[PDB]
């Protein structure tokens, strides 16, 4: 879930 949100901000 952190990795998904990181990609969203990237």
């Amino acid at each position, epitope marked *: 879930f952190k990795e*998904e949100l*990181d990609k*969203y901000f990237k």
Partner: antibody
Amino acid sequence: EVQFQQSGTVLARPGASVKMSCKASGYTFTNYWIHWVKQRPGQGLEYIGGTYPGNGDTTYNQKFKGKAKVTAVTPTSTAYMDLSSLTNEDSAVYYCTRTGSYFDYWGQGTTLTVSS
Amino acid sequence: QIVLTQSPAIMSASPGEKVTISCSATSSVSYIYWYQQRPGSSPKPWIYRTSNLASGVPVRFSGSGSGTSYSLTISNMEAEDAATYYCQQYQSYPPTFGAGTKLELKR
């Protein structure tokens, strides 16, 4: 405990710039996005932009592109926001906040007044 | 940016009373997130991915919903629950928040 220590209340003149800081502690600074969020008197919250200090990636709400610039300094675990061309609409509380898989920790806020 | 509408804007509730507040989105979103802001202080995470309680949040809180319609429930209101609650979405970029529901304690 994760903690964000934000710089103090600040007055700036219309047309000027202002730099606000957020000193992080309690976690590995390089591994999480850190963001800035705006709250004007009596209104909801508005997302500005953020940065990943591990590699310098930085992204913005398009509304604030060319208005806000977010940077992070990893050796001092400190994030910054610079706001330029200030007007009255920029008077507000500015929060820095981390995301893990949500906005999980927030600074105490910095109040900016723009006035002549 | 996706507009989230919170209802009601203001409400009061007696100690022990069940409370439900709402979040409505103009577009379907897969999850909603809720933040609590006590008067004079910063927001804090309260509920993440619709129904998970954030760190330190008491069990009388719960969340549910789907699609364009979500809610946050307090099974029995306590004085420390008086606060402003914001919903929030990451379905599209940028993240957006609702304008708040202010919950007051009816004494």
